Ligand binder design. Structure first.
Ligand SMILES: O=C(O)C(=O)CC(=O)c1ccccc1Br
Ligand SMILES: [Mg+2]
Ligand SMILES: [Mg+2]
Ligand SMILES: [Mg+2]
Length: 715
């Protein structure tokens, strides 16, 4: 074949060469020692990895049966809880404790702000994301619907001054609200100066300073007429760019050209739900981008990584600020294998194990000088998001894997830190124990509410028909889950030490709506939450200026706002809940979103796509949102809400509509020859086989179908 033999492993040549030629050089790790380490870790840890996956299946089978043997209508919560406890699903809560994780950067322990997630296989997106630490407020406002396109203020081929003025006014109000003047408004400012190290703002009638002179962080240019003024509020920087010569500045009362916000404080470079990588070739593409990010030389077309930013302190001396988003990497979880490496028997190696080895290896570069200062962690940490874990034993396993990898890489123990996704029910209900299992590695917890919703549906699949997808966000279980997560983090001493994060805004074009509603997340004490783009990061930063998360967290301390009973409230629908038109809409909406996402996954290897839903709302789709849709339809089919003819008819009805939306270029229509389309059959399979997928996961089918598509293409 095209494999390299090391011990009991047979490594795809493309991966072997990448590691030897590109990843290892510069780390001072001996190539032969590295590969011996891979062999040993894989051999040592594979058995427990398999045992954990088996335990999931066993627990689900018992719960399935428990529901089928229920006669009593209103589910008996006391009995249900006792059953979960008996089978080892619900474990004892440990005594209070405080996490001890150290060597963590300020962006994580202390700074509250947006966290951006981006597919690592897309180099351009990854570059923009790394560079999203700073972003233009004017661009974000002008370019989105945050400023309405009412009569007069519509966007067009050229600059609209009426809209420009609304942008200016919006930002002036932001400044008044965030960094207030002693008296007067920024709206009436005519200039800025620095005298005796103090910010002085010219008003038409008098001059004034900040209500809080401490918010003045520095400036650029001459003190007598700065080219910019740097402010700080709630730990985040705001920069007013002063330039009367510019188009916008010419029209401005104080010659202001733009207001720049510190935006995406940290970014997660994703190997998991937002990318499609099903073999060694795909994995290498991803690994190479992560390498380029950490070595600091990733470049497109040239677009490159930003350097740090230089400022003068109020007093006159010099300082710098980070120009890049501090990077995490999201590895895949414990489920999947990948044929990038197979053993002598031809068995595929667990992908999570490989990701820890290879992403960890590559991250070493980000800890050292780049052709420039080192790119990433100045405190010496590697930041890894670990998704889709179920319960404390699975967290303990991730910790043991990272420990073994550190030994192979010659890194200090606990270098590799863990961002824990709380996105599976068996983690939610055992959250305190999960944090404790990683007490010296954890750098965040985050409510991955989309995956968590998929797991909610699958876990209780046999219980009955679930409510419509759009109803889930307001169900008792999810509201308890969100508060429970914050409570556990604060109780474990996260304030000042680790992020308490919440989930993704998927409506990429609904920025007015995002600005209105996502403020709920920091108001709930989350020190970070997920955004889908650098523009959304800049707009979400507004919320952290309005809400003092540090104060909110202090206020929430010691509260227990969710009960186990509330967490365990299954979102069953009521009898006769739906008219036919409602059922039809749910079916068509789900099939449309499934087909829209899956067609690009299977035929083009794209793991995240904007897919208009049935209401024509552009939604960023990833595997988690697919997990929900496929599981919901699987559940409705299982309980007789819909028939197999209903499903097939809906798929065939929506497919041509998806074809139309993709009609460009490497796209192959699904209709009318449905049985000839691997993409269509994948979509169908996710629904018709959904109840039989482990925990409702979409990867086994997606990976199989993508590999099938590639094989046909090659023949
Ligand atoms: O909610 C969860 O399960 C996630 O983990 C979300 C997620 O990755 C995502 C969902 C939609 C669009 C982009 C992303 Br990065
Ligand atoms: Mg079964
Ligand atoms: Mg997730
Ligand atoms: Mg405040």
């Amino acid at each position: 074949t095209d494999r390299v033999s090391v011990g009991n492993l047979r490594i795809a040549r493309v991966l072997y060469d990448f590691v030897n030629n590109e990843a290892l050089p510069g780390t001072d790790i001996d190539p032969d020692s590295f590969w011996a380490g891979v062999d040993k870790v894989v051999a040592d840890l594979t058995p427990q990895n398999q045992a954990l996956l088996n335990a999931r299946d066993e627990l689900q089978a018992q719960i399935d049966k428990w529901h089928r043997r229920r006669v009593i209508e209103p589910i008996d919560m006391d009995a249900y809880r006792q059953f979960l406890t008996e089978i080892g699903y619900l474990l004892p809560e440990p005594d209070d404790f405080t996490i001890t994780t150290s060597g963590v950067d300020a962006e994580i322990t202390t700074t509250a702000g947006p966290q951006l997630v981006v597919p690592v296989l897309n180099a351009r997106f990854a570059l923009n994301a790394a560079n999203a630490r700073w972003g233009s407020l004017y661009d974000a406002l002008y370019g989105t619907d945050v400023i309405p396109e009412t009569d007069g203020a519509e966007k067009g081929p050229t600059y609209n001054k009426v809209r420009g003025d609304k942008v200016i006014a919006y930002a002036r109000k932001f400044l008044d609200d965030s960094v207030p003047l002693s008296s007067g408004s920024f709206g009436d400012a005519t200039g800025f100066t620095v005298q005796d190290g103090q910010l002085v703002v010219a008003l038409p009638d008098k001059s004034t300073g900040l209500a809080n002179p401490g918010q003045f962080a520095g400036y650029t240019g001459a003190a007598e007429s700065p080219t910019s003024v740097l402010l700080i509020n709630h730990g985040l920087h705001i920069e007013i760019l002063i330039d009367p010569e510019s188009q916008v500045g010419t029209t401005d009362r104080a010659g202001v050209k733009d207001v720049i916000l510190e935006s995406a404080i940290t970014t997660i470079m994703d190997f998991e739900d937002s990318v499609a990588a099903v073999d060694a070739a795909d994995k290498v593409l991803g690994y190479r981008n992560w390498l380029g990010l950490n070595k600091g030389d990733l470049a497109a077309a040239l677009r490159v990584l930003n350097r740090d930013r230089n400022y003068t302190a109020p007093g006159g001396g010099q300082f710098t600020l980070p120009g890049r988003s501090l990077m995490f990497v999201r590895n895949v979880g414990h489920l999947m294998t990948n044929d990038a490496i197979v053993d002598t028997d031809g068995s595929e190696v667990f992908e999570g194990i490989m990701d820890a080895l290879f992403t960890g290896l590559i991250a070493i570069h980000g800890l050292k000088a780049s052709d420039g200062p080192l790119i990433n962690s100045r405190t010496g940490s590697i930041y890894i998001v670990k998704p889709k874990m179920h319960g404390p034993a699975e967290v303990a396993f991730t910790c043991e894997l990272f420990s073994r990898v550190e030994d192979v890489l010659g890194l200090p123990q606990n270098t590799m830190k863990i961002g824990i996704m709380d996105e599976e029910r068996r983690t939610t209900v055992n959250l305190k124990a999960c944090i404790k299992a990683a007490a010296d590695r954890v750098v965040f917890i985050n409510t991955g509410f989309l995956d968590r919703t998929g797991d909610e549906i699958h876990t209780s699949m046999e219980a009955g028909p679930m409510v419509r997808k759009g109803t889930m966000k307001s169900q008792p279980w999810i509201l308890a889950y969100e508060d429970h997560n914050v409570d556990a983090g604060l109780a474990a001493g996260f304030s000042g030490r680790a992020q308490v994060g919440k989930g993704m805004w998927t409506m990429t074009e609904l920025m007015a709506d995002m600005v209105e509603t996502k403020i709920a997340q920091p108001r709930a004490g989350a020190s970070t939450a997920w955004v889908p783009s650098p523009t959304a990061a800049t707009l979400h930063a507004l919320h952290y200026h309005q809400v003092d998360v540090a104060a909110v967290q202090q206020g929430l301390a010691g509260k227990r706002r969710a009960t186990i009973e509330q967490l365990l409230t299954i979102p069953l629908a009521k009898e006769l809940a739906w008219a036919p038109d409602e059922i039809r809409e749910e079916v068509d909406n789900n099939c449309q979103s499934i087909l829209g996402y899956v067609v690009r996954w299977v035929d083009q290897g794209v793991g995240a796509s904007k897919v208009p839903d049935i209401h024509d709302v552009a939604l960023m789709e990833d595997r988690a949102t697919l997990r929900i849709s496929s599981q919901l339809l699987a559940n409705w089919l299982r309980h007789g809400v819909i028939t197999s003819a209903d499903v097939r008819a809906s798929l065939e009805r929506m497919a041509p509509l998806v074809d139309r939306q993709n009609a460009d270029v490497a796209y192959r229509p699904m209709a009318p020859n449905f049985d000839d389309s691997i993409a269509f059959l994948a979509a169908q399979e996710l629904i018709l086989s959904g109840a039989q997928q482990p925990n409702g996961y979409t990867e086994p089918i997606l990976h199989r179908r993508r590999r099938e598509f590639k094989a046909r293409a090659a023949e």
